[PDB]
C-alpha cells in the first residue's frame, strides 16, 4: 500500500473484490498492443503475484475469465471501452499528467462479471497504477534492491472505491549516479562482468525508480557514457519510461566520457578556438536522443567540474552557444526547439550573469543546485517565479570535494531534507528535482522521502514527517516492527548529521566535558536497540534489516567508540598512566572490528548479494579526497613497561573537590613483611588497594597521595571509603589513621558499630553491610604552604583494610553511589 | 582438562596415548567389584565418550583390549596389582585423601601393550580422577546444569606423564540449596512430578558437585525432608560419595520440617520442659544415618531461624544439651562419640558464650558464619587456631532477611568472594566451606570459583584471580570466546556488587551529577557486548551462552534502564515538562521487556528445561520480604493533554553559563501569518524552531527566554545556534535582533559570508556548510534588576531562520559539539 493504505484485506468479502483464493491470483487482462513499456509493468505484477502466492498471475489478451484486473493507458482498446461506455469517469485522466485510477466495477465487458480497473492517463501513470497494486499486495519497491522479503498470502480482496495518487506536484523526479567509484562500479562489475554500465544494469535501476514513482536519472558519468557503452541504455530506458538527463557540465546529450577518451581525437573544448569539432559532437547528440523524452542540457561550462577576460564580452560567449545550441536541436529534431525539453544548470560564473538578466529562452528550465551539503543557495523571487520553463533543484545526499569528500553512508537527516525540499517547493521550484545518490545504496531511505516529497510535498509538515519513516518502516518490516525500526532510522540519521563519518577524529567530541563519552555510549545504546530488535526479526527479514538499519548503526557506533578511544589513549598517554594500554588495545579492536562489518555487507549478507556495495574507505582521511591506500589505524600510544608504571599520581584539583581512586597514589611505603597488593575492578569503581597477606603486622605501613588545592581553603572533610570489612580479629574494630602530613591526624574506627547488638544491628550494621562499603568523614585544619601541594596519608593499623576512594571535600561534594568523579591527575617517575 | 591444562590433543601421535581413535573409543576396564560410586562415576566417563565421539566408551572387567583406561580405587583388584608390581607410585597415594594419580605406563598387565591409568586414594579420588578425564575429552561440569555443549571429536591423545591434583586443602567443600522458594520448588515440580526433592532429582545435584570435585550437600529445608521425603535421598548420596550435612538449627540428622510437619504430635522444643521427646527425635536421627560419613550437626537454637533467664547458667543449659547429644551418638553408632564427625556452628548468643570458654569438644568442627553478605564475622586468634576438630566458614550467595533478601541473581563480585575467602583461609579455616547458593542457578560461577578456591587457595592472588575466569569461560565457550566472556562475567559481576536488584529504585543514583546516565549507559554497554558476542557463538552454545552471560546482562541492563526512567520521569514531571511522557512510556516497556525475558528463559530457551528456575519476583518491594503479589510497575506520572503544555520555561544559571535549548522559550509572539513551528530532533540536540512557512512577512516575531543570573555579573556573551541557512532569499544575508529586552540589543548576520567568493569559500563556507550549524555571538551589557530575572529575546528579520540552540556565557562556557548540557529549568502555564 503505497499511495492508499489500508484496502487490501488477507481474507475475502462479498463486498471486495478478490486478488487471490486459495493460492490462485486473479488473472490481468492488457491490450497486446499496449504501450511496451506498460507491458513490462504488467509483467512484473504478473510476476509479484508469483512472489506472493506461489504462481504468477495469468497475463492474458482476451476476457476470458469471470473476474479481471483490468490494466491499460487511456488508449489501449480495453480501457478505451470503459470510458467510452461510461463505466469509468475518463474524463478524471484525460488530459492529465502520470495519474492511474483504480476502482472496482461490476460487469466491465460483456463476459466479465467484476473487475479491478488500473487505468493510466498516459505510458507512466499506467505503470504507476500497476506499482501501485504491487504494493498492495505487498512487494515493497526495495523487494530487489534492498532484499526486502515479501510476505506469502493465500488470499487478498480489496476494497471497492475509486483510488488515485493525482498528479505529480513535480514534472520530473529522479536520482544521480555519481561518486560511483569504487563502490557501484566493483558491484557492477562483479555482478555483470562489465567494466561499465549496461542495458542489464541499468533497466534494473529503471524498476526501481518507476516502482518508487520517479521518472528520471542522470547515470553514472565518472567513467561510463550511459548513451554510447550501450545502445540499449537509451532504448531500454525510452520504453520502460524514464527520462534521461545529464549533469550541469554535460551539454546536449553527450556524456562527459565520450570527449575525454578522446581527447586525443577531439580538441580542446574551448567554443571560440575549437567551434567546429565541438559543434560536431553537440549535433550528433541530439541525433542519438531524438525521438525520446530526454532532458537536453543546455549551455557550457569547462570539462571536468571547473568553469572557464570575462565579465561583459564573455557573458556574450555563453549567449552565443545557447543560441546555436538551439539551432542544432531545430536541424535535427525538425520542428522548433521549444518542442524539446532543455535545462540550463546554474553555478559559479552565471549567479552573476543572473544579475543583468542571463536567463535562457523562456522555455527552458533552469537547474538550480545546492551547496553540496544540503542547502539550497538561489531560489526564484516573485519576479522570476513567472518563468515559463520553470526551475528544478539539485540536490545531496554523498558529495565528492570540499571540505571533505562524504562517499560511505548516509548523512542527512531526515528533518535537514524535508526543511530545505518544502522551502524549495513552496518558492516554486518544482519542474526539476534530483538528487545526489552515490552509489543509491545505502541511500534507500532518504532516496523515498525525496521521491515522496517530490510528488506530493503539500502533504508532509513538520508534525507528521517522521510518520513517513514509520509507514516505510512498517512496509519493510510489518506492522509489528515499524515503530521501532523507524525509530531507529531517524536516531542514527540524526546521529550522521553531527558531523560526517569523515570528518569524526579524536577531536571532534569535547572529551573532559564528558560529550565524547555521553555520544560513544549513546551510539552504542542504538546499537543494542537494533541487535534486540534484530534478533526478533524472521529469518527472511535480516538481510534487509541489516541494509537499512543494522550495518550503519553497527558501523557508525563502532567508529564512534574507536574515535573515543584513540581520544582516551592520548589523554592516558599525556597523564602518563599505564591505563593508555588499554585504549590502544580498544582503537585496534575497533579498527579492524570495521573491516569485520563491511566484509560481512559485502560477502556473507545476502549471500555476497552486494559484493563491492561497502567497500568505501573512511578511516584515514588527511585532505578532502579519499586519495590514500585503505582503511589506516588511527595513531595511538603505549607506555612501554606497564608493570613498573605505579605511583607517582598527583592530583589538582576541580569543582569543589579531590576525588581520588585509591590505588592512584603518590606513593606508598610498605610493611614488615606486608606489601600494599592492588585488587583490580574490586569495589564499585577503579580498584581497591590492601596490604597483603592479613596475617602480618601492619606498623609502619602508609599511603600517601599528593594534590593541590587552591590557596583559599582552610579546612577539608576528608571521606575515606573502605570495603565494609567486619572486625573479625578483635571487636573493637578496625582502625586507621588520615591526616595531611605536615598538620593534624584523626584516627577513624570503621566498623565499631557493624554487629548485631540490637541499637546497631538494623540501624547500621545490615544496610552498610548490604552495600559493601563504609564510607567515613574527618574534618581537618588545612595548613599553610606556599607551593599549594598538599600530601593526604592513609596509615592502616589493623589487618584486612580494603581501602577504595578517597574525596577531600572543600564545598563541591555530593552524595552519589559511585563518590564522583576523579579529579584532574598525571603521573611522574 | 579442570585439573590439568594442555596435555589433550586432537590429533594422534606415537608418543601420546589414544583415548579415541576413528571415532572408537578405548576401552575403560573396572574391578566389577569396585566401590559402587566409583564405577557410577565410570559409567558416566563411558557416556562422556558417548557425547564427545558418537559412541559410548565400553565399560569391561577383563584386560581383553591391547590398550586401555584403568580405572579404580588403590583396593581394587587391577589397581593393587599395578602398586605391587611398582608399575605406579603407590606410595603417593596410600594414606592420601581423596586424591587421583594419573598416569600412562607400558605394559601394565600381560595382554595389554599401553594404558592410561587413573588410581586414586580412595572412593572420592578415584572419582575425582574419571572426571577429571571427563573435562580432558570436553564434557564440561556444566553439560548438564547450563546446557554446556560438548565438541564432538573423532581422535583424541594424551600427553604421558604423572597427573594428580594432590589432595584438597578443605576437607569438606559444599553447597546449600535455601531461599528454594519459588524457583527450585517450581523446577523441581514441573521436573519430576514431586512437590519434594526425591533421589532422582538428589543424584542430577550430586554428580554436579563431584564433577566439581565437591563432596559436601546442605540439602533444601524449607518444606522439604532430605532424609524423610524419599529413603533413596541419603542411600543414594552415601552409594555416589557425597557427604550431607544440615544447617545450624538442625541438630542430629533431623531436618527441621520433620519438627514443623508435625508440631501437634511433637511438643514445643524446649530442651527442659520437652526433654524426653526431644532426645527421642535426635537418637532416631543418628540411627537413620549412622554407617553413614554424613556430618553431624550438634547443639541447639530454636525452631525457625531465632535463638532461645540466660547467660551463666544458661549457657550450662548448652553444655548439657551437647553432652548428652553425644552419648546419643554413643549409644547408637556403638562407637565412642569422636569417631562421628560432628559440627557446631556458631551465631548470636554463643560467640558471647565463648568469651568465657564455651567450646564444644575438641574434635568437633566450628561453623562460623558470614554475615550474609560475603563479610566473615569472627576468625580464629592464633591461640584457638590450635583447635584439633577445626573451622567451618558458610558464605553467602543469597539470602532472605535484612536488609532486604537478595533471591534473583548472582550479586557477588569476584574480587569479593576471593578477597575474604583468602583471608578465611590464611587464618586456619579449612574444614568445612558450604557456600548458601539459593536455587543453585544463576549462581554456576561463584560456585565453581568457591569450590575450586576450597580445593587448592594457594593458586589465587590478587594479579592471577581472573584467570581462572578466563579459564572457566574457555571450557564453556571456547578458547576464541574466553575473553570476551570472562571480561563479561567480571563487569556484570561488579556492576551487581554496586547494589542489589531488590534495592535498586529510582533514588539508588545521582541523576542530576550524571551519574544515573553513566551507569544505565555503561550496563547497556555490555549488554551490547554479550549480544556481539552471541551472534558469533554456534547454534548449540546459545542456550549456555544466555544462562551464564546473555540472561543476566540483559535483565540487569533493562532493570537499570527502567529505573533510571522513572528517576527521569519523576524529574520531567516536577518541571511539568510534557518530555515525561516519553519517560513514562519507557518505564512501562522496560517492565515488559523484564517480563518478555524470564519468559525466554524459562518457556523458551533449551525448549522449557528450566521452566520454574527464574520465576523470582524483583520489582516491586517495599519492605525486606518479597511478600507482594507479583513484580509491580513502578509508579509514573504523565502530564495531561501535553501539546498545549508548551512555553513557559524559566531557566536558572548553573556552573558559569545559561544554555537552553532553543524551543524551550517563554514565550513566542507569532508573525502574520507565520507561525513558530518546532521540528522535532532537528539539529544536534533537543530540536529546532523557526516561523512556518518560508513565504510570509516575519515582521514582529519573536522568541522569549526567561532567566535568572547571580547578581554579580555585569555582562553576558550570548551565543546563537542556527542552522546553516544560506541567504537564498537576498544575497546580504538573514539577520536576526538578540538582545535583553529592556536592555541593548544588537543584529547578527550569520551567512553573510557563506558563498564561493575566494576569501570565503574555503576559509569559512563549506567548513561551516558541512557542519549544518553557524554558531555566532554578541556581547551584551547586563542591566540592573532587583529579582535577578532577565528576558532574552530573538527577533527574526528574514524568512527561514532555524533557531537550534542559545548559551549565554559569563565564565563557564566550554567549546563542544553538542554546545554543553541545558541548564535547570521548569514550567509554569
Ligand atoms: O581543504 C580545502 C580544499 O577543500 C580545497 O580543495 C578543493 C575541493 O573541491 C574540489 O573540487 C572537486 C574536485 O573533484 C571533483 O570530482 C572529480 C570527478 O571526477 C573524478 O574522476 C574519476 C575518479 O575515479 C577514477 O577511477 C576515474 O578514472 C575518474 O574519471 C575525480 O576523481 C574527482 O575528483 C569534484 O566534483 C569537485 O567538486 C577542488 O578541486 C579542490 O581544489 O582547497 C583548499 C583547501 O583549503
Ligand atoms: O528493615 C528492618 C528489618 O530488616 C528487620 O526485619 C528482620 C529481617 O530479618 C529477618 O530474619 C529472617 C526471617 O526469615 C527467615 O527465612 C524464613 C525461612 O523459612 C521460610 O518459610 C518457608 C517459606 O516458603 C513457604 O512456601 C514454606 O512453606 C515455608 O516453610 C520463610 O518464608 C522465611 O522467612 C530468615 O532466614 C531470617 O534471616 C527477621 O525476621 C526480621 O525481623 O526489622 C527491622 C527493620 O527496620
Ligand atoms: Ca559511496
Ligand atoms: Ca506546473
Ligand atoms: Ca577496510
Ligand atoms: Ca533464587
Ligand atoms: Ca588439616
Ligand atoms: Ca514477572
Ligand atoms: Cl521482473
Ligand atoms: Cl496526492
Ligand atoms: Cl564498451
Ligand atoms: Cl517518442
Ligand atoms: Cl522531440
Ligand atoms: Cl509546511
Ligand atoms: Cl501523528
Ligand atoms: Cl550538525
Ligand atoms: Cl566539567
Ligand atoms: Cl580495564
Ligand atoms: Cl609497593
Ligand atoms: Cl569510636
Ligand atoms: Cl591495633
Ligand atoms: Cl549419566
Ligand atoms: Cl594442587
Ligand atoms: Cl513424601
Ligand atoms: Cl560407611
Ligand atoms: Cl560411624
Ligand atoms: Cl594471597
Ligand atoms: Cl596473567
Ligand atoms: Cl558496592
Ligand atoms: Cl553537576
Ligand atoms: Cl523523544
Ligand atoms: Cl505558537
Ligand atoms: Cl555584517
Ligand atoms: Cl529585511
Do not use: C
Amino acid at each position: 500500500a503505497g499511495d492508499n493504505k489500508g484496502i487490501t484485506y488477507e481474507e475475502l468479502n462479498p463486498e471486495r473484490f478478490t486478488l487471490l483464493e486459495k493460492g490462485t491470483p486473479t488473472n490481468i487482462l492488457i491490450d497486446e498492443n499496449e504501450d511496451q513499456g506498460v507491458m513490462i509493468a504488467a509483467t512484473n505484477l504478473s510476476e509479484d503475484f508469483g512472489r506472493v502466492s506461489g504462481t504468477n498471475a495469468p497475463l492474458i489478451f482476451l476476457p476470458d475469465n469471470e473476474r479481471l484486473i483490468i490494466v491499460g493507458t487511456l488508449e489501449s482498446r480495453y480501457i478505451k471501452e470503459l470510458t467510452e461506455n461510461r463505466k469509468i469517469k475518463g474524463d478524471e485522466l484525460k488530459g492529465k499528467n502520470e495519474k492511474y485510477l483504480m476502482t472496482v466495477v461490476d460487469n466491465p465487458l460483456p463476459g466479465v462479471k467484476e473487475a479491478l480497473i488500473i487505468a493510466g492517463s498516459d505510458k507512466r501513470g499506467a505503470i504507476y497504477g500497476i506499482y501501485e497494486l504491487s504494493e498492495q499486495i505487498g512487494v515493497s519497491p526495495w523487494y530487489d534492491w534492498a532484499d526486502v522479503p515479501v510476505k506469502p498470502q493465500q488470499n487478498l480482496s480489496i476494497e471497492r472505491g475509486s483510488y488515485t495518487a493525482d498528479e505529480p506536484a513535480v514534472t520530473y523526479r529522479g536520482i544521480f549516479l555519481n561518486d560511483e567509484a569504487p563502490a557501484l562500479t566493483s558491484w557492477v562489475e562483479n555482478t555483470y562482468g562489465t567494466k561499465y554500465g549496461d542495458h542489464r544494469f541499468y533497466s534494473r535501476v529503471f524498476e526501481l525508480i518507476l516502482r518508487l514513482r520517479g521518472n528520471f536519472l542522470w547515470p553514472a558519468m565518472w567513467d561510463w557514457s550511459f548513451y554510447g557503452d550501450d545502445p540499449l541504455n537509451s532504448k531500454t530506458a525510452d520504453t520502460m519510461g524514464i527520462i534521461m538527463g545529464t549533469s550541469h557540465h554535460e551539454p546536449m546529450a553527450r556524456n562527459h566520457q565520450e570527449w575525454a577518451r578522446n581527447r586525443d581525437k577531439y580538441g580542446v573544448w574551448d567554443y571560440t578556438s575549437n567551434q567546429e569539432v565541438i559543434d560536431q559532437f553537440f549535433r550528433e547528440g541530439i541525433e542519438r536522443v531524438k525521438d525520446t523524452d530526454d532532458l537536453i542540457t543546455i549551455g557550457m561550462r569547462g570539462d571536468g567540474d571547473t568553469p572557464m577576460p570575462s565579465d561583459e564580452d564573455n557573458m556574450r560567449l555563453l549567449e552565443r552557444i545557447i543560441k546555436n545550441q538551439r539551432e542544432i536541436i531545430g536541424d535535427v529534431t525538425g520542428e522548433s526547439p521549444e518542442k524539446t525539453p532543455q535545462v540550463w544548470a546554474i553555478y559559479k560564473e552565471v549567479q552573476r550573469y543572473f544579475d543583468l538578466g542571463l536567463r535562457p529562452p523562456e522555455d527552458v528550465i533552469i537547474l538550480l543546485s545546492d551547496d553540496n551539503w544540503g542547502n539550497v543557495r538561489r531560489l526564484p523571487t516573485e519576479e522570476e517565479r513567472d518563468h515559463p520553463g520553470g526551475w528544478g533543484m539539485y540536490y545531496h545526499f554523498d558529495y565528492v570535494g570540499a571540505p571533505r569528500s562524504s562517499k560511505w553512508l548516509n548523512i542527512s537527516p531526515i528533518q535537514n531534507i524535508w526543511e530545505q525540499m518544502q522551502l524549495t517547493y513552496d518558492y516554486g521550484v518544482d519542474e526539476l528535482w534530483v538528487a545526489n545518490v552515490g552509489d543509491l545504496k545505502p541511500m534507500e531511505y532518504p532516496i523515498t522521502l525525496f521521491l515522496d516529497m517530490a510528488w506530493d510535498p503539500t502533504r508532509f509538515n513538520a508534525e507528521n514527517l517522521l510518520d513517513h519513516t514509520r509507514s516505510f518502516a512498517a512496509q519493510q518490516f510489518g506492522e509489528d516492527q515499524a515503530d521501532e525500526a523507524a525509530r531507529i532510522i531517524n536516531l542514527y540519521s540524526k546521529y550522521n548529521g553531527r558531523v560526517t563519518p569523515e570528518m569524526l577524529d579524536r577531536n571532534t567530541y569535547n572529551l573532559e566535558s564528558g560529550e565524547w563519552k555521553k555520544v560513544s555510549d549513546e551510539y552504542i545504546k542504538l546499537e543494542a536497540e537494533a541487535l534486540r530488535q534484530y534478533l526478533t526479526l524472521e529469518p527472511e527479514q535480516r538481510d534487509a534489516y541489516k541494509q537499512l538499519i543494522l550495518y550503519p548503526v553497527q558501523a557508525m557506533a563502532n567508529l564512534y567508540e574507536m574515535y573515543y578511544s584513540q581520544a582516551m589513549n592520548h589523554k592516558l598517554y599525556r597523564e602518563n598512566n599505564p591505563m593508555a594500554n588499554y585504549w590502544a588495545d580498544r582503537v585496534e579492536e575497533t579498527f579492524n572490528r570495521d573491516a569485520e562489518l563491511s566484509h560481512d555487507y559485502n560477502k556473507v549478507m545476502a549471500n555476497g548479494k552486494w559484493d563491492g556495495m561497502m567497500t568505501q574507505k573512511k578511516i584515514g582521511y588527511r585532505s578532502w579526497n579519499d586519495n590514500f591506500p585503505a582503511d589506516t589505524l588511527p595513531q595511538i600510544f603505549r607506555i612501554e613497561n606497564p608493570e613498573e608504571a605505579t605511583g607517582g599520581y598527583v592530583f589538582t584539583a576541580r569543582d569543589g573537590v579531590v576525588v581520588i581512586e585509591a590505588e592512584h597514589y603518590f606513593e606508598a611505603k610498605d610493611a614488615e613483611e606486608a606489601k600494599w597488593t592492588v585488587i583490580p575492578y574490586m569495589g564499585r569503581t577503579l580498584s581497591s588497594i590492601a596490604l597483603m597477606p592479613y596475617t602480618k603486622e601492619v606498623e609502619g605501613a602508609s599511603l600517601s597521595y599528593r594534590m593541590q588545592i587552591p590557596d583559599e581553603v582552610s579546612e577539608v572533610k576528608v571521606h575515606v571509603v573502605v570495603k565494609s570489612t567486619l572486625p573479625f580479629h578483635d571487636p573493637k574494630g578496625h582502625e586507621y589513621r588520615v591526616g595531611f602530613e605536615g598538620g593534624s591526624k584523626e584516627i577513624v574506627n570503621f566498623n565499631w558499630n557493624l554487629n548485631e547488638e540490637p541499637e546497631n544491628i538494623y540501624s547500621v550494621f545490615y544496610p552498610t553491610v548490604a552495600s559493601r562499603v563504609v564510607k567515613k568523614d574527618v574534618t581537618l585544619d588545612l595548613h599553610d604552604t606556599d607551593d599549594g601541594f598538599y600530601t593526604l596519608t592513609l596509615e592502616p593499623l589493623d589487618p584486612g583494610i580494603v581501602f577504595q576512594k578517597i574525596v577531600v571535600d572543600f564545598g563541591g561534594y555530593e552524595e552519589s553511589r559511585l563518590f564522583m568523579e576523579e579529579s584532574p591527575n598525571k603521573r611522574i617517575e
